[PDB]
Amino acid sequence: PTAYALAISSLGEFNSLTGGTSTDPVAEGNDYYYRFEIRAWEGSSGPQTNVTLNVTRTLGNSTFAGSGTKGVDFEVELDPDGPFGPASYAPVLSADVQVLAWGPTGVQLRYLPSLAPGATLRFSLRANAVNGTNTTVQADATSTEAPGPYTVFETTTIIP
Amino acid sequence: AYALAISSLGEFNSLTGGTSTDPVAEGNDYYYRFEIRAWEGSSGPQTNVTLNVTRTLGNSTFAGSGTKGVDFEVELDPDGPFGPASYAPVLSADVQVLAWGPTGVQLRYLPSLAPGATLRFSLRANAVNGTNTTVQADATSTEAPGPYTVFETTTIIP
Ligand SMILES: [Ca+2]
Ligand SMILES: [Ca+2]
Ligand SMILES: [Ca+2]
Ligand SMILES: [Ca+2]
């Protein structure tokens, strides 16, 4: 018997914040973008609150870029009906995302509106590529109702 | 001289196409997808490009005895993101099944993998438990031993 559940997934790296094409490996000195989804269980008793992505760099030398400008350094898109309906991802309002932390080795982004059962959020995160060591990042999803943990690790090959 | 990369694409409700999933209800099949990606700057094609996937947490199991088109799929995008050629399934004889069991699978692409080209692997699993299933995906080639490793995690509803 389950009241609330959340899920996280890695979508890998891309050459643009939104759209564009996939990448990895990445050349040192170029920007690239990690994308992750947080997904609300369709069977949830209700909307979920304080749905938050935390990403931390665990290995390697690439750095999350900028001071945390929405539309440049990160994006958050809502698919209001998730995979259960034909509504597409669209960027959410700037006021709907709280930047709890933004720095070279980690970021934390909280979605302020409640997340309806089945709905999904896509987080896109700009990074500067650095070194011939793989960059690995730990991505964590939480809500108030579903603390998890829900954790993935995505890895990027960086060409020196 | 040579480099590889790996990425998770997350879970899907079909082997190819269909829609994304996760969470998954216990009792249902679902599919992990991973890409192995040949560095465009590589000196030449790479050999023995292998995906190894092993369960690190939870109770979901890789399904079936390892039948291509049912339990797994391997697609080649011959020019990767660098050109508009699409993914298409490779021939069965181009994929060596080094291992296939509930807790681990190993799939080797036998033709050489051209610089810039990408492979997409899809893997059927049976969902079990109210603990998250997490899998470790490793990419290797002869010329780029790595390893290159990601961890994808699935929420399973009891
Ligand atoms: Ca997942
Ligand atoms: Ca939708
Ligand atoms: Ca990757
Ligand atoms: Ca292509």
Ligand 3 centroid to B83 CA: how many Å? 19
Which member of B7, B151, B157 has the closest CB to residue A24?
B7
Q: Is B27 exposed, middle or buried (0-12, 13-18, 19+ CB in 10 A)?
A: exposed
Yes or no: say if B3 and B94 are a contact pair by the CB < 8 Å rule: no
Nearest to A127 by CA among A39, A36, A46, A63: A63
Residues of chain B contacting A2 with CB distance shorter than 8 Å: 130, 157-158
* Neighbour tally for A58: CB within 10 Å: 13
Minimal-distance CA residue of chain A relative to B82: A21
Header resolution in angstroms: 2.2
Q: From residue B18, give the alpha-carbon distance in Å to each of A1, A84, B12, B14, B67.
A: 28, 11, 7, 5, 20
Residues of chain B contacting A140 with CB distance shorter than 8 Å: none
Yes or no: say if A107 and A98 are a contact pair by the CB < 8 Å rule: no
Tokens of A152: 């993935």
Yes or no: say if B38 and B111 are a contact pair by the CB < 8 Å rule: no
CATH of the domain at A102: 2.60.40.740
Domain containing B40: what range?
Answer: 4-157
Tokens of B36: 């192995």
Tokens of B142: 């002869």
| Strands, E assignment, chain B | 4-12, 24-25, 29-38, 49-57, 61-62, 72-77, 88-89, 95-101, 104-109, 118-126, 133-140, 148-154, 156-157
Sign of dihedral through CA atoms A90, A95, A99, A103? positive
Q: What angle do CA B54, B79, B136 make, to 5 degrees?
A: 10
Alpha carbons A2 and B132: distance in angstroms, whole number: 14
Q: What is the DSSP string of chain A?
A: --S--EEEEEEEEESSSSSS-EE-SEETT-EEEEEEEEEE-TT-SS-B-SEEEEEEEEESS-EE-SS--BTTTEEEEEETTGGGSSPPPEEPPGGGEEEEEEETTEEEEEE-S-B-TT-EEEEEEEEE--SSS-EEEEEEEE-SS----EEEEEEE-EE-
The DSSP symbol for B68 reads: B
* Neighbour tally for A57: CB within 10 Å: 19
Phi, psi at residue B81, to the nearest 5°? -75, 0
Breaks, C-N > 2.5 A, in chain B lie after none
Nearest to B7 by CA among B41, B36, B46, B50: B36
Alpha carbons A40 and A4: distance in angstroms, whole number: 8
Tokens of A13: 């790296």
Residues of chain B contacting A25 with CB distance shorter than 8 Å: 3-5, 37, 39-40
AA identity, residue B78: P
Nearest to B104 by CA among B51, B29, B158, B49: B51
Ligand 4 centroid to B85 CA: how many Å? 4
Taking an 8 Å cut-off on Cβ atoms, the answer to whether B157 and A2 are in contact is yes
Yes or no: say if B106 and B52 are a contact pair by the CB < 8 Å rule: yes
* Neighbour tally for B86: CB within 10 Å: 10
Which ligand neighbours the alpha carbon of B77 most closely? 4
Alpha carbons A99 and A68: distance in angstroms, whole number: 7
Taking an 8 Å cut-off on Cβ atoms, the answer to whether B132 and A154 are in contact is no
Q: How many domains does chain B have?
A: 1
Residue with tokens 């996937």: B53
Alpha carbons A111 and A132: distance in angstroms, whole number: 34
Ligand 4 centroid to A21 CA: how many Å? 10
* Neighbour tally for A28: CB within 10 Å: 14
